[PDB]
Symmetry: D2
Subunit: 258 residues, 4 copies
């Protein structure tokens, strides 16, 4: 089966990658980083996010696996000492596939992006003001530092820091949180995070300034002459290769509690 | 078609009820408060909640409708001046049905309850400490004032006041928020709200004291010698009779923004 | 010098107390629990709080010291292994005095209380609604679970759990936090915590129900037929005996960070 | 008495300024924008902030007054219809002076600034990580979007949006709030806002990147090769000219409640 391996690029990670490739050399298994079916990321969640965006045009044909060389990750959930056990189990399709929802962002002047964690919007100068339209209905005028739209698996990331809820990734949804909203007798936002199902469209529209810094996972690009930013749960999903039970809520406990 | 009407019990509401009954007297329509198919609540969301619990044994055979005699409600979403237009449209099944998820609570010493808004748990004295187990996995030890588990439509209620997200009620889920958790170098909770899908079981277990004040919507009962409190998305749903489009997010805007 | 010693009442604490008394038997030092000048508390912050209220009529004539037999305390800030070094240093007034502000609560039907941590107010049934008057000016109508008024040293306690700021205890102030306020288009509270200087009077007045559960540190009493609850920074202070530098912010770091 | 008048620069404000100057032409009163003793700002709080920074080298010799041509301000607290009554009362020192605390920021590579609202710190790229040192003691390592240090009168501004407490400006203090901190099992911040008295020094030190975007009220400057950012309550104060009672908490109510 075709496979490739990305590495964080420090010694630990590069050496681990070379050993797994040697381990794969003993099986009906070929290294192909153009059309892989398995993509292994070694490092952290940032390495994993890059792996994802490296191959976002072939999401339906790939199963992703992560190894965390440092502390435990949400995406990278094998340890390095289990690398040889992983090579073996992958050798004979010894695994089921789990799919997580993704977020589609569309920027109109159309540019389109997929996010596995989130996409955010901030001003370029400059005060940030946007009208927030849900399924064509004007919901609120937001004045503040910015807004964040998170996938379910992204809810443990930036979303969490903004006061958002943690959502189980089997729920096909997206979640909008505020960054430092101005609320006074005249200016009013909802305050609360908002959780949208598939097929709901959240559209952001400028009020005066039309330049925004827009982020999609790690990527951050200043966009000029924007007319609309549109968010929706993507039709596409990320597929993970799973060899044992490691439940989301256990992943959350391990990362945040002890 | 069989129908009944509950009233807040002030003059406005009682008089409105008598007029709708007179209006229904002109159609193939009989008043039955033992086996209604339509249940009309006149007053506020508290009146509507009572209507719901009055007939919780026949949820699958009833369509609920609410009229708000005061300010706009989340459940009661006709105005009184539209009462006559409502009587007419109800006369000939001129309507589609919308269903909202509900919350099952089980108290073991089994007593079982349905909630349309939420169920909460607090101590009776007395410091509140509980172990929180998700799908048999020990997730956290909670020390604080209490916990709240909200349905999607309940997310605009007590959940909102506790920092929770607002969830679209087409999402079959429940949401757990904290009330004043103690967090220090030794005591640790997740902090964030948590959103669970159907079939996930959140169980609360005592640590020392086993007496808790437990609430289910308006009802609040001191329970003694508790071994477990179990939360899950119910298999049962509340059905609403709908005569026009009034989207959830518009309902939220109207109630919280302007 | 006259002194007494309170104990948590477990073996560790009782034995430690007996040894310090034996150690004090070797100096110009007599045990008097009616008119002490030094009050030593052995246990936790709860033991220390009790020590304080045991002698609240002689606050101006007492220096308090705490020993924490378990984890580190905010009030109890010697370890047990340093008990003998403490007995020695106390023997010859080898110490400076530090004073912390306190909170005066007045309940009118007058009953008056001092708090070292905080005083809170909740309803007895029953929905909680109160008008909040600051220096005779009507500030807001609060609807929610309750309110908490914290001293500076109390800001690390319940205040912290409610979202309040941590205040350095050299600031003569009190801080009011909300518990789960209802905020909708009709009902409005400030949301933010509020920090008042000496001589500001915060008065809470009932709207309909006049029975409230009122707490002052550990004490919690249901009060009936209340007309007013009045908060102000007390004219009286708690005095601590200090033998070495242990800064507040270091105390906060040690307890909350690592 | 020497005086000058700044204007927002729209027609309402410019015309109001010309009329007050004409009104002042009838008294022992001369217009001097180099060495004024009275500085009148017409517009909003942004206009007032600019007035302040325009004359920050002569704070001890100036009394500031604000007129709000739009909605009510925290600094600008006369209405335009009362402009003629204001000209008259100013004519014969018919007024007492009120002083508010200010914030000193020092940036070391020394550049120094005064803030009436706040100073904030964010990264230039780029992840923001800083060590936070209080009175030479290492308190925490902050990872997140940034930090905000607010004066008492600034607590109704950006501080409020970040979850901070509102402080009465007679309290000589500063208040530090977090912007979106990362908190997981490894990374730890205090979370809570922190309120410091005069003479406490909060120092921020870089960990890796040494370029930061630093804001002081409206001014925002990218600073390069920073070694330290130091915050403390300034020795200097802003003086307001006061003609009638308009208490802070009433100002807060009027702006945030109704
Ligand atoms: N202010 C703030 N607070 C919290 N999170 C932020 C903030 N700013 C950015 N981020 C997050 O950082 C990532 C950028 O990715 P990256 O390239 O790694 O850059 P970074 O700035 O390095 O990411 C920040 C941290 O977030 C961790 N991370 C990434 N994804 C998750 C999920 N899904 N749950 C929990 N923790 C996660 C990541 O783990 P890792 O250490 O890589 O194993 C880092 O520890 C972005 O998608 C945001 O979600
Ligand atoms: N501290 C606090 N904060 C917020 N909400 C609380 C709090 N304590 C209780 N409650 C809520 O109050 C209800 C009890 O119902 P009730 O008999 O009406 O008693 P109440 O104490 O009267 O209810 C409190 C308010 O909550 C409103 N309410 C009820 N349901 C909702 C939903 N789904 N969204 C938004 N607002 C709602 C209700 O509307 P209404 O005025 O009836 O049209 C009241 O204005 C309970 O289910 C909780 O969700
Ligand atoms: N829901 C909730 N959250 C946070 N704190 C609460 C809550 N409910 C009550 N409390 C606090 O608990 C105390 C009651 O005192 P007690 O008799 O000990 O009862 P408890 O319920 O045991 O107190 C709760 C905890 O608060 C600790 N505590 C007490 N004072 C402080 C200060 N000043 N800073 C930090 N931590 C503190 C105390 O330390 P300790 O363990 O005694 O050394 C306990 O760990 C009360 O004054 C409140 O401030
Ligand atoms: N994200 C976010 N949330 C809240 N406040 C922010 C935010 N970003 C910047 N700001 C504040 O905006 C100011 C910048 O001043 P400005 O030139 O006016 O620019 P702006 O971006 O226009 O200021 C934002 C708003 O803050 C108001 N403001 C200014 N000072 C105060 C105080 N002390 N209390 C309450 N409200 C206040 C001001 O009133 P005004 O309308 O001028 O009468 C504006 O309505 C800065 O000092 C921050 O405190």
């Amino acid at each position: 089966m075709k496979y490739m391996i990305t590495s964080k690029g420090d010694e630990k990670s590069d050496l681990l990658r070379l050993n797994m490739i040697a381990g794969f050399g003993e099986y009906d298994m070929e290294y192909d980083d153009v059309e892989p079916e398995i993509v292994i990321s070694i490092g952290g969640d940032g390495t994993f996010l890059s792996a994802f965006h490296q191959y976002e045009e072939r999401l339906d044909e790939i199963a992703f696996i992560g190894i965390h060389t440092g502390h435990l990750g949400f995406y990278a959930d094998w340890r390095p000492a289990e690398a040889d056990k992983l090579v073996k189990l992958l050798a004979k399709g010894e695994y089921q596939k789990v799919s997580y929802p993704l977020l589609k962002t569309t920027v109109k002047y159309e540019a389109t992006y997929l996010a596995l964690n989130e996409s955010t919007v901030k001003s370029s100068g400059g005060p940030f003001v946007v009208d927030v339209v849900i399924n064509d209905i004007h919901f609120e005028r937001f004045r503040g530092d910015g807004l964040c739209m998170s996938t379910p698996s992204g809810t443990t990331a930036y979303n969490k820091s903004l006061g958002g809820a943690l959502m189980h990734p089997s729920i096909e949804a997206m979640q909008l949180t505020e960054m430092a909203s101005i609320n006074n007798r005249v200016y009013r936002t909802i305050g609360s995070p908002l959780v949208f199902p598939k097929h709901h469209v959240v559209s952001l529209q400028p009020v005066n300034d039309k330049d925004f810094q827009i982020s999609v996972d790690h990527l951050s690009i200043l966009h000029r002459d924007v007319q609309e930013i549109r968010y929706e749960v993507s039709a596409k999903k990320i597929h993970f290769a799973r060899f044992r039970s490691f439940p989301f809520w256990r992943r959350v406990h391990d990362s945040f509690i002890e």
